[PDB]
Amino acid sequence: LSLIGRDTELFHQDINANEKELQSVVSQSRFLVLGGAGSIGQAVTKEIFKRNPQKLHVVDISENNMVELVRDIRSSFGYINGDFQTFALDIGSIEYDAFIKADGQYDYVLNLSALKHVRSEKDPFTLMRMIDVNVFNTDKTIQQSIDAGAKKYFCVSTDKAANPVNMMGASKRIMEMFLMRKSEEIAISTARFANVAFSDGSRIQKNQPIRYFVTPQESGELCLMSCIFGENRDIFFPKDMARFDNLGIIKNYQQELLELFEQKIGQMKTDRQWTKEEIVQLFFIMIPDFGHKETGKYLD
Amino acid sequence: SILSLIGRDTELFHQDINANEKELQSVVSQSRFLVLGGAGSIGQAVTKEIFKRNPQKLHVVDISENNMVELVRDIRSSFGYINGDFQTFALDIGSIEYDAFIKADGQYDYVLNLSALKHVRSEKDPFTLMRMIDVNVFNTDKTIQQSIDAGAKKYFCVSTDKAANPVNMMGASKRIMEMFLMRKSEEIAISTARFANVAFSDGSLLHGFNQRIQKNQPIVAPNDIKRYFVTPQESGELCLMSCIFGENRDIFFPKLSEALHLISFADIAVKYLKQLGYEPHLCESEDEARELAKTLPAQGKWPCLFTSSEFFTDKETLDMARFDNLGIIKNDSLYQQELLELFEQKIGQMKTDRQWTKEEIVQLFFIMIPDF
Ligand SMILES: NC(=O)c1ccc[n+]([C@@H]2O[C@H](COP(=O)([O-])OP(=O)(O)OC[C@H]3O[C@@H](n4cnc5c(N)ncnc54)[C@H](O)[C@@H]3O)[C@@H](O)[C@H]2O)c1
Ligand SMILES: NC(=O)c1ccc[n+]([C@@H]2O[C@H](COP(=O)([O-])OP(=O)(O)OC[C@H]3O[C@@H](n4cnc5c(N)ncnc54)[C@H](O)[C@@H]3O)[C@@H](O)[C@H]2O)c1
Ligand code: NA
Ligand code: NA
Ligand code: NA
């Protein structure tokens, strides 16, 4: 916070003016946080936890990082009287589906799960996984939230207003299209942001050599602010410019493109083979001005 | 530095490694390797052991894209680059994606599986427990079958931490895995390792000490639990030795040398705080500790809360002659076809029903392992 060089909170004024309702609403509410052991997900979870939630379940595929989340929560805040549980699960698995079928009762579902790295686009196999995790897992969990009568689904929008340049952004833009179809049935709000300092994946232990930033805690409050107070299709961002002081709001598909997407990806999976180029060609149909190029190819 | 923390000053396998270095280098340079769970704590270590000996082919697979980035950065600064086929893939071994990766390629000489769910608490609920069964039993059995299908010469994976009966579902899962492994070992050479505590491995109490220090939080550690500790590199060296030199069914493990001492977790914390330039302050309360953590680190003290509450049995066939530093158990565990089929049938049906209870799994585990 001072490590990135700043005096104060970005949202000093905004959470202040709403703290009591934030407190109020969290007290009487039930929360499912997907990807909750990730860098943004740990901060969102910690923001829900310190406000005394009635129910807070955290799901994340990383068994190790979840353990740390918990350790961190115990030291920071101690213990809470609501029902706080954690589950080291893959959101796309039968185990997660069983989890939901056995309970599934939440008011707010927040999804900070993702594959986000450029490594992950280099090969058709991880690229397919990125699609599963960023697009289809998001679509399925929104459906599950709808079927449970959740009030609100939060997720993290693309990082940029404009056109994706890589496969990760493209996957986020495609995810958004599936969101738009779902927003006919449940309120959906997103957060658009950039550069949470010290995020996972962003040397001294191993004696090896070694812009604007926001803190992890600031990223958790925004997601929370959008979750609780965001209207359907709202995208909250860090600064409708009149509702809040440091928070902005972007007020925000083709059925046949979505169908074509599910069909093509579906067939590739059935065939049990596909090339990166197949997927890239499909993306270009999905996103018209997709400014992906073959200049990466010439980079070693 | 890790060594000095675990009350030792010299590597464990310096003699066995040095004695076999030339042959290690010959083998690695003409062989293809697949490391599953290779972004994990032992995974990375064995991946580095392979990489530095200039392998023909080395493919790393793990669900953590973040820890993979760390593995590659570490490899780049430690060793640089090789001519051979080094690639990483952030894939879940249970997935269509991973199966399509194997169908397209799968051509490896040596397949190493350091993937797992390992936290005892992953027993809490029936959903995490089912995942642990999928990751520790079924993924292992499948990747072995995929290795037989591609003509791999050797599959390596981890053994149960102890020779004694399991006491929790974790150990039972690894014990059930071993039954599946024994069946597969009638078709391909399989060898394993049994490890001491690997110092600072991800998710461990020790790894926790780093986090606590980084987050200005109290250190918490049992003062009444002692363990043997090894370094990450030592874990990696043991994997590679069992991999390259293990015979079908050999369990490699570190001999208790005169250097290896039992040390308590509290004792490691104190050593570790002093190496960081801090003096431990013994607190007698969580609440106290939390408050003292805000101001004490400034004045070079750290609040501490110190709490309290065999690699081989005697009927195991050993080879203690082959290596100086490494012991070999000649595993002769058995399986019954019918109990393996039962387990696959009953687990498959729980998955079909989309519902199951913890106690249903426990009951199946009692049939699989009667003395559990
Ligand atoms: N950190 C930043 O500065 C930043 C900036 C812009 C956008 N974002 C976006 O915010 C989101 C989170 O970013 P992050 O920095 O927190 O990423 P992260 O890697 O730190 O956390 C992602 C989490 O998702 C989990 N996950 C992946 N697949 C899963 C699955 N199948 N089931 C359950 N969990 C799964 C991972 O274990 C990880 O904990 C991402 O979409 C990222 O693109 C982050
Ligand atoms: N660390 C120790 O002290 C220790 C001691 C004795 C035995 N062991 C055993 O050694 C093995 C590894 O220990 P570790 O300390 O390196 O654990 P670890 O948690 O650091 O690493 C396990 C790795 O497996 C990966 N993984 C899990 N599921 C996967 C999947 N479905 N697909 C792809 N990757 C997957 C994880 O992301 C992780 O990188 C485990 O069986 C453990 O029980 C460890
Ligand atoms: Na060869
Ligand atoms: Na092929
Ligand atoms: Na071949």
Side-chain angles (χ1 to χ4, degrees), chain B residues 17 21 24-25 28-29 49-55 240:
Chain B
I17 289 293
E21 190 50 57
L24 279 169
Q25 275 177 32
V28 171
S29 82
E49 293 299 300
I50 300 179
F51 191 94
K52 67 168 88 168
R53 289 180 176 90
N54 184 39
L240 182 64

Side-chain angles (χ1 to χ4, degrees), chain A residues 86 95 120 122 132 206 208, chain B residues 70 74 88 97 124 134:
Chain A
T86 65
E95 293 91 339
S120 299
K122 53 148 205 56
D132 282 3
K206 316 179 165 81
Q208 276 160 10
Chain B
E70 172 60 11
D74 195 359
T88 68
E97 289 91 346
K124 274 174 326 86
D134 278 339

Side-chain angles (χ1 to χ4, degrees), chain A residues 3-45:
Chain A
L3 210 173
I4 62 184
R6 279 201 283 121
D7 272 323
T8 189
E9 288 241 71
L10 217 179
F11 310 100
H12 198 160
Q13 270 76 291
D14 306 34
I15 68 78
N16 206 286
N18 286 245
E19 188 55 38
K20 289 178 85 261
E21 215 197 305
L22 240 177
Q23 181 58 60
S24 172
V25 103
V26 167
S27 279
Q28 296 177 332
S29 283
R30 302 165 293 176
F31 291 86
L32 175 57
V33 180
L34 308 182
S39 327
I40 286 74
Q42 276 188 25
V44 161
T45 305

Side-chain angles (χ1 to χ4, degrees), chain B residues 52-311:
Chain B
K52 67 168 88 168
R53 289 180 176 90
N54 184 39
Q56 235 181 38
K57 188 179 183 189
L58 169 62
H59 285 188
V60 193
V61 180
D62 197 289
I63 47 173
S64 170
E65 45 162 16
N66 298 334
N67 294 333
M68 195 82 80
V69 170
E70 172 60 11
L71 169 57
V72 185
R73 293 189 194 285
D74 195 359
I75 279 167
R76 304 275 78 122
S77 51
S78 295
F79 312 132
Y81 304 83
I82 60 183
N83 295 331
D85 175 8
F86 178 69
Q87 303 187 67
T88 68
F89 298 90
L91 298 178
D92 184 315
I93 292 162
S95 65
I96 303 317
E97 289 91 346
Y98 177 85
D99 284 351
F101 159 86
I102 295 291
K103 189 183 173 267
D105 182 359
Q107 285 287 297
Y108 302 101
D109 299 297
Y110 296 100
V111 178
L112 294 82
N113 187 359
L114 285 308
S115 78
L117 260 77
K118 67 163 176 184
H119 287 275
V120 166
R121 59 233 104 273
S122 287
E123 259 182 60
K124 274 174 326 86
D125 68 272
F127 320 113
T128 312
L129 190 49
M130 178 61 89
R131 179 177 174 221
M132 149 181 278
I133 288 163
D134 278 339
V135 173
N136 296 347
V137 185
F138 294 112
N139 284 2
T140 306
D141 192 58
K142 179 189 75 177
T143 53
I144 300 167
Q145 183 70 50
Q146 297 174 326
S147 298
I148 295 144
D149 294 348
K153 64 167 134 151
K154 181 81 175 291
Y155 188 98
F156 165 81
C157 61
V158 311
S159 266
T160 52
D161 297 358
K162 52 194 135 206
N165 268 48
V167 290
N168 54 38
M169 303 295 281
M170 248 292 295
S173 79
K174 305 277 194 79
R175 177 64 187 101
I176 293 151
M177 182 216 284
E178 182 181 33
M179 296 175 184
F180 282 87
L181 254 53
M182 286 317 95
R183 174 163 72 179
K184 284 304 189 300
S185 70
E186 295 169 343
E187 292 180 72
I188 187 170
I190 302 179
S191 78
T192 68
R194 176 171 285 143
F195 304 94
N197 287 46
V198 182
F200 296 91
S201 68
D202 201 9
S204 75
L205 255 190
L206 261 62
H207 168 86
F209 301 164
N210 292 321
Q211 296 292 108
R212 303 289 68 67
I213 295 303
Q214 206 176 290
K215 299 179 178 183
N216 278 102
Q217 285 162 344
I219 302 255
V220 165
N223 59 13
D224 65 350
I225 309 306
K226 291 147 122 207
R227 300 285 183 243
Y228 298 120
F229 291 87
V230 293
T231 68
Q233 180 164 327
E234 286 178 338
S235 67
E237 284 172 335
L238 182 68
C239 290
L240 182 64
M241 290 295 299
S242 175
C243 192
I244 302 301
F245 298 106
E247 296 182 75
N248 200 17
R249 304 183 184 96
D250 279 356
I251 307 166
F252 278 35
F253 67 94
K255 290 165 154 174
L256 307 185
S257 87
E258 178 76 294
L260 273 184
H261 296 296
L262 294 164
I263 299 157
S264 83
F265 289 103
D267 276 352
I268 299 301
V270 180
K271 278 156 204 279
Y272 174 59
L273 290 170
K274 299 207 184 159
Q275 229 166 255
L276 267 21
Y278 292 120
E279 273 295 307
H281 186 92
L282 264 132
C283 307
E284 66 187 341
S285 173
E286 262 223 8
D287 282 358
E288 181 189 32
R290 195 175 291 104
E291 288 276 278
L292 297 179
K294 320 199 186 163
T295 191
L296 273 179
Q299 295 140 60
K301 277 181 146 292
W302 208 277
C304 295
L305 197 133
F306 298 144
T307 217
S308 63
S309 78
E310 253 118 47
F311 298 123

Side-chain angles (χ1 to χ4, degrees), chain A residues 204-218:
Chain A
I204 300 291
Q205 272 215 265
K206 316 179 165 81
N207 298 56
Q208 276 160 10
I210 309 181
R211 153 171 60 117
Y212 292 128
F213 294 92
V214 128
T215 71
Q217 199 194 298
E218 283 171 353

Side-chain angles (χ1 to χ4, degrees), chain A residues 137-164:
Chain A
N137 286 355
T138 301
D139 190 57
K140 167 181 89 163
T141 63
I142 299 169
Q143 189 60 55
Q144 280 164 345
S145 302
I146 284 169
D147 293 343
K151 287 163 181 324
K152 178 69 141 297
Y153 187 97
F154 173 81
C155 69
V156 186
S157 276
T158 36
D159 307 4
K160 266 182 296 105
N163 274 287

